[PDB]
Write a protein that binds this DNA or RNA. Structure first.
Ligand SMILES: [Mg+2]
Ligand SMILES: [Mg+2]
Ligand SMILES: [Mg+2]
Ligand SMILES: [Mg+2]
Ligand SMILES: [Mg+2]
Ligand SMILES: [Mg+2]
Ligand SMILES: [Mg+2]
Ligand SMILES: [Mg+2]
Ligand SMILES: [Mg+2]
Ligand SMILES: [Mg+2]
Ligand SMILES: [Mg+2]
Ligand SMILES: [Mg+2]
Ligand SMILES: [Mg+2]
Ligand SMILES: [Mg+2]
Ligand SMILES: [Mg+2]
Ligand SMILES: [Mg+2]
Ligand SMILES: [Mg+2]
Ligand SMILES: [Mg+2]
Ligand SMILES: [Mg+2]
Ligand SMILES: [Mg+2]
Ligand SMILES: [Mg+2]
Ligand SMILES: [Mg+2]
Ligand SMILES: [Mg+2]
Ligand SMILES: [Mg+2]
Ligand SMILES: [Mg+2]
Ligand SMILES: [Mg+2]
Ligand SMILES: [Mg+2]
Ligand SMILES: [Mg+2]
Ligand SMILES: [Mg+2]
Ligand SMILES: [Mg+2]
Ligand SMILES: [Mg+2]
Ligand SMILES: [Mg+2]
Ligand SMILES: [Mg+2]
Ligand SMILES: [Mg+2]
Ligand SMILES: [Mg+2]
Ligand SMILES: [Mg+2]
Ligand SMILES: [Mg+2]
Ligand SMILES: [Mg+2]
Ligand SMILES: [Mg+2]
Ligand SMILES: [Mg+2]
Ligand SMILES: [Mg+2]
Ligand SMILES: [Mg+2]
Ligand SMILES: [Mg+2]
Ligand SMILES: [Mg+2]
Ligand SMILES: [Mg+2]
Ligand SMILES: [Mg+2]
Ligand SMILES: [Mg+2]
Ligand SMILES: [Mg+2]
Ligand SMILES: [Mg+2]
Ligand SMILES: [Mg+2]
Ligand SMILES: [Mg+2]
Ligand SMILES: [Mg+2]
Ligand SMILES: [Mg+2]
Ligand SMILES: [Mg+2]
Ligand SMILES: [Mg+2]
Ligand SMILES: [Mg+2]
Ligand SMILES: [Mg+2]
Ligand SMILES: [Mg+2]
Ligand SMILES: [Mg+2]
Ligand SMILES: [Mg+2]
Ligand SMILES: [Mg+2]
Ligand SMILES: [Mg+2]
Ligand SMILES: [Mg+2]
Ligand SMILES: [Mg+2]
Ligand SMILES: [Mg+2]
Ligand SMILES: [Mg+2]
Ligand SMILES: [Mg+2]
Ligand SMILES: [Mg+2]
Ligand SMILES: [Mg+2]
Ligand SMILES: [Mg+2]
Ligand SMILES: [Mg+2]
Ligand SMILES: [Mg+2]
Ligand SMILES: [Mg+2]
Ligand SMILES: [Mg+2]
Ligand SMILES: [Mg+2]
Ligand SMILES: [Mg+2]
Ligand SMILES: [Mg+2]
Ligand SMILES: [Mg+2]
Ligand SMILES: [Mg+2]
Ligand SMILES: [Mg+2]
Ligand SMILES: [Mg+2]
Ligand SMILES: [Mg+2]
Ligand SMILES: [Mg+2]
Ligand SMILES: [Mg+2]
Ligand SMILES: [Mg+2]
Ligand SMILES: [Mg+2]
Ligand SMILES: [Mg+2]
Ligand SMILES: [Mg+2]
Ligand SMILES: [Mg+2]
Ligand SMILES: [Mg+2]
Ligand SMILES: [Mg+2]
Ligand SMILES: [Mg+2]
Ligand SMILES: [Mg+2]
Ligand SMILES: [Mg+2]
Ligand SMILES: [Mg+2]
Ligand SMILES: [Mg+2]
Ligand SMILES: [Mg+2]
Ligand SMILES: [Mg+2]
Ligand SMILES: [Mg+2]
Ligand SMILES: [Mg+2]
Ligand SMILES: [Mg+2]
Ligand SMILES: [Mg+2]
Ligand SMILES: [Mg+2]
Ligand SMILES: [Mg+2]
Ligand SMILES: [Mg+2]
Ligand SMILES: [Mg+2]
Ligand SMILES: [Mg+2]
Ligand SMILES: [Mg+2]
Ligand SMILES: [Mg+2]
Ligand SMILES: [Mg+2]
Ligand SMILES: [Mg+2]
Ligand SMILES: [Mg+2]
Ligand SMILES: [Mg+2]
Ligand SMILES: [Mg+2]
Ligand SMILES: [Mg+2]
Ligand SMILES: [Mg+2]
Ligand SMILES: [Mg+2]
Ligand SMILES: [Mg+2]
Ligand SMILES: [Mg+2]
Ligand SMILES: [Mg+2]
Ligand SMILES: [Mg+2]
Ligand SMILES: [Mg+2]
Ligand SMILES: [Mg+2]
Ligand SMILES: [Mg+2]
Ligand SMILES: [Mg+2]
Ligand SMILES: [Mg+2]
Ligand SMILES: [Mg+2]
Ligand SMILES: [Mg+2]
Ligand SMILES: [Mg+2]
Ligand SMILES: [Mg+2]
Ligand SMILES: [Mg+2]
Ligand SMILES: [Mg+2]
Ligand SMILES: [Mg+2]
Ligand SMILES: [Mg+2]
Ligand SMILES: [Mg+2]
Ligand SMILES: [Mg+2]
Ligand SMILES: [Mg+2]
Ligand SMILES: [Mg+2]
Ligand SMILES: [Mg+2]
Ligand SMILES: [Mg+2]
Ligand SMILES: [Mg+2]
Ligand SMILES: [Mg+2]
Ligand SMILES: [Mg+2]
Ligand SMILES: [Mg+2]
Ligand SMILES: [Mg+2]
Ligand SMILES: [Mg+2]
Ligand SMILES: [Mg+2]
Ligand SMILES: [Mg+2]
Ligand SMILES: [Mg+2]
Ligand SMILES: [Mg+2]
Ligand SMILES: [Mg+2]
Ligand SMILES: [Mg+2]
Ligand SMILES: [Mg+2]
Ligand SMILES: [Mg+2]
Ligand SMILES: [Mg+2]
Ligand SMILES: [Mg+2]
Ligand SMILES: [Mg+2]
Ligand SMILES: [Mg+2]
Ligand SMILES: [Mg+2]
Ligand SMILES: [Mg+2]
Ligand SMILES: [Mg+2]
Ligand SMILES: [Mg+2]
Ligand SMILES: [Mg+2]
Ligand SMILES: [Mg+2]
Ligand SMILES: [Mg+2]
Ligand SMILES: [Mg+2]
Ligand SMILES: [Mg+2]
Ligand SMILES: [Mg+2]
Ligand SMILES: [Mg+2]
Ligand SMILES: [Mg+2]
Ligand SMILES: [Mg+2]
Ligand SMILES: [Mg+2]
Ligand SMILES: [Mg+2]
Ligand SMILES: [Mg+2]
Ligand SMILES: [Mg+2]
Ligand SMILES: [Mg+2]
Ligand SMILES: [Mg+2]
Ligand SMILES: [Mg+2]
Ligand SMILES: [Mg+2]
Ligand SMILES: [Mg+2]
Ligand SMILES: [Mg+2]
Ligand SMILES: [Mg+2]
Ligand SMILES: [Mg+2]
Ligand SMILES: [Mg+2]
Ligand SMILES: [Mg+2]
Ligand SMILES: [Mg+2]
Ligand SMILES: [Mg+2]
Ligand SMILES: [Mg+2]
Ligand SMILES: [Mg+2]
Ligand SMILES: [Mg+2]
Ligand SMILES: [Mg+2]
Ligand SMILES: [Mg+2]
Ligand SMILES: [Mg+2]
Ligand SMILES: [Mg+2]
Ligand SMILES: [Mg+2]
Ligand SMILES: [Mg+2]
Ligand SMILES: [Zn+2]
Ligand SMILES: [Zn+2]
Lengths: 59, 5, 122, 118, 37, 71, 131, 204
RNA sequence: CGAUGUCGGCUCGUCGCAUCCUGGGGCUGAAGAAGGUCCCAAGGGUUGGGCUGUUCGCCCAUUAAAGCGGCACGCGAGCUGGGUUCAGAACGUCGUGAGACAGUUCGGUCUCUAUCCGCCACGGGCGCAGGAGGCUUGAGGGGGGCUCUUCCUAGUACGAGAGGACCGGAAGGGACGCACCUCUGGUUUCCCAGCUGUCCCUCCAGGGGCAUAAGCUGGGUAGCCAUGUGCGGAAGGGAUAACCGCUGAAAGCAUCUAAGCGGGAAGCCCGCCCCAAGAUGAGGCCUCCCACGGCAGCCGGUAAGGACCCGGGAAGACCACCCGGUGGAUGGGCCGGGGGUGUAAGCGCCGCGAGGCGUUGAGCCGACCGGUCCCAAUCGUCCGAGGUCU
């Protein structure tokens, strides 16, 4: 190869147009039925230890 | 690098 | 699957023992020859005082291939060597004996005298 | 392409991955429940279930077969005398993977528990 | 058909006609047929 | 010159960018007899065409002067 | 649906059960219906079964025989209608499912490696004693 | 012009006149006429076929209303056969007889991101003689300052397969109507279990 | 000249047409067959080798043919580096010499990261005046487009004979293209077995690690594949080119033309296959929800629907697409079948023993075809119309 290199400085408008896709999405959170605390679905509740109606781990 | 000789 | 550079044993008594394929006589640009196809070949090894001699450019029909030939009945057949019978421009053998079995495909392709002279048609 | 290919690679060559499943098997049959990353946990189920099912068979042949992976006669002895009887009437499904809520701090890895079923 | 830039009568039985924007020579002798081109 | 074919092409050997891109080499073919003469003696195609035609003539002459001798 | 069952159902009209069981290492004689110019005749191909690749109705087997100084291998569909009959000529004992290695063996070398399978020879002699 | 929806079952081969016939098995029957496109209403002629009954618990209200207007049980797949007006309200394999020639359309197998060699049969590069990290590369893609660009449609690496492919003029080897089975000679796009469409050939 | 890398090869093409072949013609010193010559025609095709760095050229064996050119003598931020084109050395030659040479000879550092245009793929956003789920028309694009041999007609027409047709009709190929995995043939990183050295478990027996990122070897399912299989080039309609006419003046004849009408190419349009309504000119059909509440706008709560999350998938870089989510057979397990390996361990018997025999087609056993709720797709959350004007 022959060491490609930017031909022009990227403008403030262009670099920020590139970043139009970089916003995070907030995490999906559901209320845990046992203790009402918000937590990701399909995970053992890290607050009360519950999943699928029963206790699965100590907290 | 070769030369234009 | 015979192509240029391929060596074949000679299954006749012309005196040629080994021919080297130089052309697949099958249209403009055939990649391979199988049983019943004709090739042009150089004679790479011959026994003394034969019909043909080393260095001759000759024609031959392929009679056995190591690549298996498949058949409409769903079967196949495979030989231990690649072998050919030297012929003239009228497709007739140039020797008087044919050594070893030959593919029945040769019958279907008008090499009847060869089929006649072979000790087994398979 | 990977069309209809079964089996995860986990960025380990063939012997490292085999040894990985063996060691995770030993830890699981030892502690009953272990935490690991989600993909490892999913793959561990079948590796361990097979060793438990062979233990449920109980013959000498099965014991020597289980021994090729577990290597530990005490642990195999615990497998045949304590673990396997719990599953006599169970037709597979001896292991359970539930996913944890909080990721590993230093690399973001999603975690899960794998445990023997009751 | 002769195709050339100079088309003329070759024999006394030749006929110069203009059909379809082109000059032709026609003749009972088929050697003498000419198109200008 | 109607029974003669003249081929031009790049020459062999030294010259740098010049010899790489210049059709200085010449071949002259006597089409009936088939005998050829080549010349890349100079840098110029026209000089090599002239020298090649000279040698070709001289050689066809010796061929004609020799069959005349054998008769 | 059950795609496997559909294919087996399509195939079942073409399945045979008249042929004797054989194994790689056995010497076998396939009488094969062969067309020759106009007519059809039966041609016997006898040799050692060096391979049986299984796929239900699509099973094929390969038979090897040295014919007039040249090795010949014929590959047969096990359920082809072109096969008149297969006669077991001999039971050989092999240690592996595919006998490719016998292509590079001498005559005595094959004789030594594929010895007579007494067990299945006795099974063959005990059968045919059902009169 | 007749047609039917079907599923690729798998390949096998049958024997017919002492010949092995490679076949692909298709499960085509039965397809209920769900809507007929007419010149008066739609500007063209076609029959919307259904295929495979579906769990009504998974069929939303817009689709349930569509099936209702036909009095037809909910169906997994709706495809139109263009320029086809069957007599009945159901289409079965019976529309084909052994010996006819059909066109089969399916969704090819997806190679994903495919190299220039797999996708376009390019020659790639040499494997020795100094070839430097280009063994599967496409080589030159243009000229120089004229035209100074790359043509549209340029053969390059990219996605391959999982696209509509129609293979044409296939022999109908057999029709087994009690199982809704069509047997076709040769190869048919896509994987086992794929949806296919079987039309009367356009070859003559 | 504060650098526009210079030959040939390779790779990938694309264009021109002054056409190499194939298609259509006129003239022929065209009997037929085969040629010559010119005209039309760029749709497709245009082989493999020996020599040399070669371009070029010659040669071998074929072919329908083995076209010629443009694209920075197309293409080195795509590869090569044999030649050219530095520093070493040598021969011939020139020079007293240092050195010199379109003279020769052997050797001689070719730079991981693509910003913008362009190109191949794939998404995100908004738009297409209600909000939605399907199914579609095809403007416009793209793909493709080759050709040979044999047979019949008929050994006829033609020819003294040798030779040997048109027209029409069959059959079989080569190369290329798309798809496919039944067959043939590959792979198959752990699916089975055998084998050595060493260390270990547990002493025997049986096993495990390592010898590669498989220690080695014999095999090998599914998948992915070609060497394997199917299928394609069309047919057909239309309009034409050169060319051939009909009728027919000007110009009592003649004229394909000036009025008008025919015939006529592998080319052109359509036809075939694929894309496609961002076709902002944003199309059509079938179905679904519906006038909600608060000062062409805002604010919520909803509808039909959708997304999030999860189980996955011959779908896939991510994304997307597709299926499934307990009213469930989606993955995992388990079971049956297929498939591979080829007769496990243990035991008993024979042998001094290595081993052999039997139990036994046994044991093991990825992915393939199925069954089975045993394990996991728990529980949910958030979006999402109220329809401008004439
Ligand atoms: Mg580079
Ligand atoms: Mg470079
Ligand atoms: Mg480099
Ligand atoms: Mg760089
Ligand atoms: Mg700049
Ligand atoms: Mg920049
Ligand atoms: Mg700036
Ligand atoms: Mg700014
Ligand atoms: Mg800035
Ligand atoms: Mg930018
Ligand atoms: Mg800013
Ligand atoms: Mg970025
Ligand atoms: Mg954010
Ligand atoms: Mg011989
Ligand atoms: Mg001989
Ligand atoms: Mg010699
Ligand atoms: Mg000699
Ligand atoms: Mg001979
Ligand atoms: Mg790939
Ligand atoms: Mg893929
Ligand atoms: Mg890969
Ligand atoms: Mg799988
Ligand atoms: Mg594995
Ligand atoms: Mg890695
Ligand atoms: Mg790694
Ligand atoms: Mg990594
Ligand atoms: Mg690592
Ligand atoms: Mg290792
Ligand atoms: Mg442990
Ligand atoms: Mg604890
Ligand atoms: Mg841990
Ligand atoms: Mg881990
Ligand atoms: Mg398993
Ligand atoms: Mg015991
Ligand atoms: Mg979970
Ligand atoms: Mg940390
Ligand atoms: Mg860290
Ligand atoms: Mg998470
Ligand atoms: Mg004149
Ligand atoms: Mg006249
Ligand atoms: Mg000239
Ligand atoms: Mg030059
Ligand atoms: Mg030189
Ligand atoms: Mg110099
Ligand atoms: Mg030099
Ligand atoms: Mg110059
Ligand atoms: Mg199947
Ligand atoms: Mg023998
Ligand atoms: Mg022995
Ligand atoms: Mg025995
Ligand atoms: Mg499909
Ligand atoms: Mg479809
Ligand atoms: Mg698909
Ligand atoms: Mg495929
Ligand atoms: Mg590639
Ligand atoms: Mg390829
Ligand atoms: Mg491809
Ligand atoms: Mg290549
Ligand atoms: Mg290659
Ligand atoms: Mg390499
Ligand atoms: Mg290099
Ligand atoms: Mg490179
Ligand atoms: Mg390399
Ligand atoms: Mg490249
Ligand atoms: Mg440039
Ligand atoms: Mg350049
Ligand atoms: Mg430009
Ligand atoms: Mg795709
Ligand atoms: Mg396609
Ligand atoms: Mg056909
Ligand atoms: Mg039939
Ligand atoms: Mg059925
Ligand atoms: Mg300069
Ligand atoms: Mg500068
Ligand atoms: Mg500058
Ligand atoms: Mg510079
Ligand atoms: Mg060109
Ligand atoms: Mg022209
Ligand atoms: Mg022509
Ligand atoms: Mg012509
Ligand atoms: Mg003639
Ligand atoms: Mg004549
Ligand atoms: Mg002519
Ligand atoms: Mg002319
Ligand atoms: Mg052309
Ligand atoms: Mg050549
Ligand atoms: Mg050589
Ligand atoms: Mg060469
Ligand atoms: Mg050369
Ligand atoms: Mg030269
Ligand atoms: Mg010629
Ligand atoms: Mg010709
Ligand atoms: Mg250049
Ligand atoms: Mg060039
Ligand atoms: Mg270049
Ligand atoms: Mg370079
Ligand atoms: Mg270069
Ligand atoms: Mg460049
Ligand atoms: Mg550059
Ligand atoms: Mg570049
Ligand atoms: Mg550049
Ligand atoms: Mg060099
Ligand atoms: Mg070098
Ligand atoms: Mg210097
Ligand atoms: Mg001297
Ligand atoms: Mg002096
Ligand atoms: Mg002097
Ligand atoms: Mg001197
Ligand atoms: Mg000098
Ligand atoms: Mg010099
Ligand atoms: Mg010179
Ligand atoms: Mg030199
Ligand atoms: Mg020298
Ligand atoms: Mg040099
Ligand atoms: Mg050296
Ligand atoms: Mg580098
Ligand atoms: Mg960029
Ligand atoms: Mg720019
Ligand atoms: Mg761009
Ligand atoms: Mg979009
Ligand atoms: Mg509208
Ligand atoms: Mg609206
Ligand atoms: Mg929609
Ligand atoms: Mg949908
Ligand atoms: Mg459409
Ligand atoms: Mg269009
Ligand atoms: Mg447009
Ligand atoms: Mg078009
Ligand atoms: Mg065409
Ligand atoms: Mg005749
Ligand atoms: Mg007649
Ligand atoms: Mg004659
Ligand atoms: Mg004809
Ligand atoms: Mg093409
Ligand atoms: Mg393909
Ligand atoms: Mg496939
Ligand atoms: Mg298969
Ligand atoms: Mg296969
Ligand atoms: Mg195979
Ligand atoms: Mg294993
Ligand atoms: Mg060991
Ligand atoms: Mg031991
Ligand atoms: Mg160790
Ligand atoms: Mg190691
Ligand atoms: Mg090694
Ligand atoms: Mg090993
Ligand atoms: Mg292996
Ligand atoms: Mg293999
Ligand atoms: Mg396989
Ligand atoms: Mg295989
Ligand atoms: Mg396979
Ligand atoms: Mg494939
Ligand atoms: Mg192939
Ligand atoms: Mg074809
Ligand atoms: Mg055609
Ligand atoms: Mg017309
Ligand atoms: Mg008149
Ligand atoms: Mg008239
Ligand atoms: Mg007019
Ligand atoms: Mg007309
Ligand atoms: Mg007419
Ligand atoms: Mg479409
Ligand atoms: Mg739209
Ligand atoms: Mg659309
Ligand atoms: Mg607008
Ligand atoms: Mg509007
Ligand atoms: Mg527009
Ligand atoms: Mg509008
Ligand atoms: Mg619309
Ligand atoms: Mg419309
Ligand atoms: Mg969606
Ligand atoms: Mg996935
Ligand atoms: Mg995705
Ligand atoms: Mg992601
Ligand atoms: Mg993904
Ligand atoms: Mg996402
Ligand atoms: Mg869903
Ligand atoms: Mg749910
Ligand atoms: Mg399931
Ligand atoms: Mg299951
Ligand atoms: Mg899975
Ligand atoms: Mg089985
Ligand atoms: Mg079996
Ligand atoms: Mg035994
Ligand atoms: Mg045993
Ligand atoms: Mg033992
Ligand atoms: Mg034993
Ligand atoms: Mg004893
Ligand atoms: Mg033994
Ligand atoms: Mg078995
Ligand atoms: Mg095992
Ligand atoms: Mg098992
Ligand atoms: Mg099984
Ligand atoms: Mg399959
Ligand atoms: Mg059930
Ligand atoms: Mg909840
Ligand atoms: Zn909780
Ligand atoms: Zn005249």
């Amino acid at each position: 190869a022959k060491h490609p290199v930017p031909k022009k400085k990227t403008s403030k408008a262009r670099r920020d147009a590139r970043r139009s896709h970089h916003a995070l999405t907030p995490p999906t959170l559901v209320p845990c039925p046992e203790c009402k605390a918000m937590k990701p679905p399909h995970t053992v509740c890290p607050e009360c230890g519950y999943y699928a109606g029963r206790k699965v781990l100590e907290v | 690098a070769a030369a234009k000789c | 699957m015979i192509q240029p550079q391929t060596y074949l044993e000679v299954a006749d008594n012309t005196g040629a023992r080994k021919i080297m394929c130089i052309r697949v006589l099958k249209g403009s640009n055939a990649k391979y020859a199988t049983v019943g196809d004709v090739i042009v070949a150089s004679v790479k090894e011959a026994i003394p005082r034969g019909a043909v001699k080393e260095g001759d450019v000759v024609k031959a029909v392929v009679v056995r291939t190591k690549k298996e030939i498949k058949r409409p009945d769903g079967s196949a057949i495979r030989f231990d060597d690649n072998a050919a019978v030297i012929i003239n421009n009228q497709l007739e053998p140039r020797g008087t004996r044919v050594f070893g079995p030959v593919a029945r495909e040769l019958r279907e392709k008008g090499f009847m005298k060869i089929v006649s002279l072979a000790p087994e048609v398979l | 392409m990977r069309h209809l290919k079964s089996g995860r690679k986990l960025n380990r060559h063939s012997s490292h991955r085999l040894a990985l499943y063996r060691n995770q098997a030993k830890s699981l049959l030892t502690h009953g429940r272990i935490t690991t990353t989600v993909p490892k946990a999913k793959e561990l189920r079948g590796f361990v279930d097979h060793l438990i099912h062979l233990a449920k068979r109980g013959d000498l042949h099965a014991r020597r077969l289980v021994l090729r992976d577990l290597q530990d006669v005490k642990l195999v002895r615990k497998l045949f005398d304590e673990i396997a009887p719990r599953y006599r009437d169970r037709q597979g499904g001896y292991t359970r993977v539930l996913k944890l809520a909080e990721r590993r701090r230093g690399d973001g890895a999603p975690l899960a528990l794998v445990e023997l079923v009751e | 058909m002769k195709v050339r830039a100079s088309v003329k009568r070759i024999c006394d039985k030749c006929k110069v006609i203009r059909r379809h924007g082109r000059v032709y020579v026609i003749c009972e002798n088929p050697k003498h047929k000419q198109r200008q081109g | 010159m109607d029974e003669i074919r003249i081929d031009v092409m790049r020459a062999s050997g030294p010259g740098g960018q010049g010899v790489n891109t210049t059709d200085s080499a010449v071949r002259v073919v006597h089409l009936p007899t088939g005998i050829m003469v080549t010349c890349q003696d100079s840098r110029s195609q026209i000089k090599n065409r002239e020298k090649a035609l000279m040698i070709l003539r001289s050689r066809l002459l010796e061929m004609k002067r020799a069959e005349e001798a054998e008769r | 649906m059950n795609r496997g069952a559909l294919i087996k159902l399509v195939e079942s009209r073409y399945v045979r059960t008249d042929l004797p069981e054989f194994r790689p290492g056995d010497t076998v004689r396939v009488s094969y219906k062969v067309k020759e110019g106009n007519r059809t005749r039966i041609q016997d191909f006898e040799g050692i079964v060096i391979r049986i690749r299984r796929n239900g109705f699509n099973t094929t087997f390969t038979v090897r025989k040295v014919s007039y100084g040249v090795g010949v291998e014929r590959i047969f569909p096990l359920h082809s209608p072109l096969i008149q009959k297969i006669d077991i000529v001999q039971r050989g004992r092999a240690r592996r499912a595919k006998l490719y290695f016998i292509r590079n063996l001498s005559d005595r070398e094959i004789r030594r490696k594929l010895r007579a399978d007494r067990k299945r020879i006795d099974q063959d002699r005990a059968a045919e004693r059902a009169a | 012009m007749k047609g039917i929806l079907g599923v690729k079952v798998g390949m096998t081969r049958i024997f017919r006149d002492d010949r092995a016939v490679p076949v692909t098995v298709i499960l085509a029957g039965p397809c209920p006429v769900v809507q007929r496109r007419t010149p008066e209403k739609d500007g063209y002629t076609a029959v919307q076929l259904g295929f495979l009954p579906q769990n009504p618990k998974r069929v939303n209200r817009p689709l349930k209303g569509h099936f209702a207007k036909a009095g037809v049980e909910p169906v997994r797949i709706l495809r139109e056969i263009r320029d086809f007006n069957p007599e009945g309200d159901t289409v079965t394999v019976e529309i084909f007889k052994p010996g006819e020639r059909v066109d089969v359309t399916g969704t090819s197998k997806g190679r994903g991101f495919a190299g220039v060699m797999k996708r376009w049969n390019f020659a790639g590069g040499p494997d020795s003689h100094g070839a430097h990290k280009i063994h599967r590369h496409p080589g030159s893609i243009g000229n120089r300052k004229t035209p100074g660009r790359v043509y549209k449609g340029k053969k390059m690496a990219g996605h391959y397969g999982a696209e509509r492919v129609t293979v044409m003029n296939l022999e109908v080897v057999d029709v087994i109507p009690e199982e809704n089975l069509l047997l076709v000679k040769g190869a048919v796009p896509g994987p086992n279990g794929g949806l296919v469409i079987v039309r009367e050939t356009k070859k003559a």
